[PDB]
Each structure stands twice: as C-alpha cells, then as structure tokens.
Design an enzyme around this catalytic site. Structure first.
Site, PDB file in Angstrom:
ATOM      1  CG  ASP A 128      44.870  10.492  51.809  1.00  0.00           C
ATOM      2  OD1 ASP A 128      43.816   9.765  51.827  1.00  0.00           O
ATOM      3  OD2 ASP A 128      44.952  11.424  51.011  1.00  0.00           O
ATOM      4  CG  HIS A 180      36.710   4.975  43.289  1.00  0.00           C
ATOM      5  ND1 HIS A 180      37.965   5.503  43.179  1.00  0.00           N
ATOM      6  CD2 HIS A 180      36.230   5.768  44.291  1.00  0.00           C
ATOM      7  CE1 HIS A 180      38.292   6.473  44.005  1.00  0.00           C
ATOM      8  NE2 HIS A 180      37.245   6.684  44.676  1.00  0.00           N
ATOM      9  CD  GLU A 218      40.222   9.264  45.718  1.00  0.00           C
ATOM     10  OE1 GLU A 218      39.615   8.324  45.830  1.00  0.00           O
ATOM     11  OE2 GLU A 218      39.488  10.354  45.790  1.00  0.00           O
TER      12      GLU A 218
HETATM   13  C1  LNO Z   1      35.826  11.338  48.977  1.00  0.00           C
HETATM   14  C2  LNO Z   1      34.654  10.797  49.859  1.00  0.00           C
HETATM   15  C3  LNO Z   1      33.333  11.521  49.659  1.00  0.00           C
HETATM   16  C4  LNO Z   1      34.706   9.302  49.564  1.00  0.00           C
HETATM   17  C5  LNO Z   1      36.172   8.738  49.928  1.00  0.00           C
HETATM   18  N1  LNO Z   1      36.767  10.040  50.402  1.00  0.00           N
HETATM   19  C6  LNO Z   1      36.602   8.220  48.557  1.00  0.00           C
HETATM   20  O1  LNO Z   1      37.600   8.595  47.859  1.00  0.00           O
HETATM   21  N2  LNO Z   1      35.784   7.319  48.114  1.00  0.00           N
HETATM   22  O2  LNO Z   1      36.261   6.958  46.871  1.00  0.00           O
HETATM   23 ZN    ZN Z   2      37.643   8.205  45.899  1.00  0.00          ZN
END
Ligand code: LNO
Ligand code: ZN
Ligand code: CA
Ligand code: CA
Ligand code: CA
Ligand code: CA
Length: 316
Positions: free
Chosen positions: A226, A146, A166
């Site tokens: 989301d 990220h 993501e």
């Molecule tokens: C996916 C999890 C374990 C962490 C949160 N959901 C996320 O995208 N962090 O980047």
């Molecule tokens: Zn993430």
C-alpha cells in the site's frame, strides 16, 4: 454541452430521492451549470476507458437502478463544492472554478473509487464487499479532497507524506458528511460497505484499531504494501484529528477538544499554507501548531489541544 439549465429528480444508491441540476439540449444531461465552470457526470458503461459518455437522459427522471450511482456522484460533488466554497472560501479544487468530472459504472464489480489526477472514477462494487461507491458522501468528498491536495500541498502518494494525504481526504470527507447532516460519524464508507454486515466500516477515525490500523506512531507500519502503508498509517493522523475535535484521553494523554469547525480550519490552512510535497508527520504537526497559532494565538487553548493530540499519537 450548450443548453438550458433545469432541475431533475432521481433516486440515489440508498433509495433516497433528490433533485439534481441538469442541462437541456434535446436530451437532459447530467451537467450542472450553477457551480463554477460546472459539474459533469459520465457513463463509463462498465469499461475502463475514461471519461466515457456525458450522461444523457430523455425525461429528466433518473429513477432506474442503472441511474442511482450517477445521481449520487453528481449531487454529492455538488454539496462538496459547496462546502469548500462556503466554509473555506475555495472555488472548486483548483481555486479557480475548474469543472468537476466524475465517471460511474467503471469496470465490472470494481470495488473502489479514486481521483486519477484529472477526474473522479467510481466502481459499482461486487455487491457484497461494496455497493456503488458514489453512495457514500464521505467517499465522494474524500476523492474531491484528493484534487484539492494535488492542487495545494501536492503530497507525494507514498510513505508518510502519502498517509497524510489519505488522512486529509478522510478528515474533509468526514467534515463534508457532518456539513450535510447526512447521519455523520467518524467513520469511513460505512454507507457503501458490506451491505450484509451492520455497523461496520472501511476505517474508523474514532478508533482506528477496530479494524487494525495503528492509532499510535509506535505502531506505524514500515513495510511496502500500500505504497508504504498510506491507507494504514493514515489512522495515526485520523486519531489525532479525532482527539482535537472531540477531546479524550489516549494512552494516558488528555486532549480538550476544540470542535470541528476549528479542526477544519486549522487543517485547511496547514494544508494550503504550510504543507509541501514531501512533508512527514513531524512536519504536519509543526504546520498544524503553526496554523492554530496563526488563527487563535500562541497561547490559545486551540494551540494547546493540537499539541496534546499529536503527543497522545506519539508524533514527536
Ligand atoms: C478509500 C477508497 C474508498 C478509495 C481509495 N481507497 C482511495 O484512497 N481513493 O482515494
Ligand atoms: Zn484516498
Ligand atoms: Ca429517465
Ligand atoms: Ca454516516
Ligand atoms: Ca462516515
Ligand atoms: Ca456494512
């Protein structure tokens, strides 16, 4: 901290033992001086106040249960930095050796981990849905990745550019997991998720539908939760990424797989050379095809399998 570099031993979240780089200055610090400008691990002590305290230990032995998440956060950050540097030639997430900072034991029974724009944060879980999140190396590399996106394409966190964001992190968190030979798969968070169920996982790349994620553009989620479904529509790109590497017939569309070495490299190039903050799934496809073409040529097999996989997922 200023001090002497040494090495300590600790037990991870899974009960596995390992060596971690530390620094000595009266106390032994979770400060690794051997990677770039270093890796720093902090104790958030169950508060929400960040970073919290640089981790201090008096004997260089991290075998207490409270120590488990700091050990893994610290170490796993270390192989991720290594993967980046050895495989894509990048120094740290900024490309300049910036220090990696991580905070563990954040809040009380926090079921998640994140990149906040300047550091990584890890909750400890409720002990049923999740166990301390730094225990999953794919979670740890997903999070660092990220940083890497933020400093390269900069994909805004919402709608399609955020689902691409993501999926990048899930694609490189999975490449990092294979990179370390830590029982790899095409699954996300399996190691820290639902300590009582076996064989399950947060998300699947091989079959996003297992858990209900679209595996096709026509399945794409169009509402609002989301952030317009950043963690939902990411399955469409994970499925595509999964087909290019391994191959397969999705919805009657056949893909010859070119393997993961080549999937990492056409993606890191798309991510660093052609993705922009506002890129959408049709733009990712152009960018992936353009990178594949840059590297392997116009008429390669690699170029053909990236087309096939986006066609199988219904992207364009
Ligand atoms: C996916 C999890 C374990 C962490 C949160 N959901 C996320 O995208 N962090 O980047
Ligand atoms: Zn993430
Ligand atoms: Ca100790
Ligand atoms: Ca695994
Ligand atoms: Ca995994
Ligand atoms: Ca489980």
């Amino acid at each position: 901290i200023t001090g002497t570099s040494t090495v300590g031993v600790g037990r991870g979240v899974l009960g596995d033992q390992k060596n971690i780089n530390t620094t000595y200055s009266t106390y032994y610090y979770l400060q690794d001086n051997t990677r770039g400008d270093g890796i720093f691990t902090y104790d958030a002590k169950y508060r929400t106040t960040l970073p919290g305290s640089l981790w201090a230990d008096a004997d260089n032995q991290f075998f207490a249960s409270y120590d488990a998440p700091a050990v893994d956060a610290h170490y796993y950050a270390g192989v991720t930095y290594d993967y980046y540097k050895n495989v894509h030639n990048r120094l740290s997430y900024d490309g300049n050796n910036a220090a990696i900072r991580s905070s563990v034991h954040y809040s009380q029974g926090y079921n998640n981990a994140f990149w906040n724009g300047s550091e990584m944060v890890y909750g400890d879980g409720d002990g049923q849905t999740f166990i301390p999140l730094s225990g999953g190396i794919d979670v740890v590399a997903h999070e660092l990745t990220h940083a890497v996106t933020d400093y390269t394409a900069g994909l805004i966190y919402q709608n399609e550019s955020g689902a691409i964001n993501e999926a990048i992190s899930d694609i490189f968190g999975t490449l990092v997991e294979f990179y370390a030979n830590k029982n790899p798969d095409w699954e996300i968070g399996e190691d820290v998720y639902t300590p009582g169920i076996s064989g399950d996982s947060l998300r699947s790349m091989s079959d996003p539908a297992k858990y209900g994620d679209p595996d096709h553009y026509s399945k794409r989620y169009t509402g609002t939760q989301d952030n317009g479904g950043v963690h939902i529509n990411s399955g469409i790109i994970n499925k595509a990424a999964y087909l290019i590497s391994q191959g397969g017939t999705h919805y009657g569309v056949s893909v010859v797989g070119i393997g993961r070495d080549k999937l990492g490299k056409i993606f890191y190039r798309a991510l660093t050379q052609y993705l922009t903050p506002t890129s959408n799934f049709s733009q990712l496809r152009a960018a992936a095809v353009q990178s594949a073409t840059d590297l392997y040529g116009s008429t390669s097999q690699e170029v053909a399998s990236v087309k096939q996989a986006f066609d199988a997922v219904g992207v364009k």
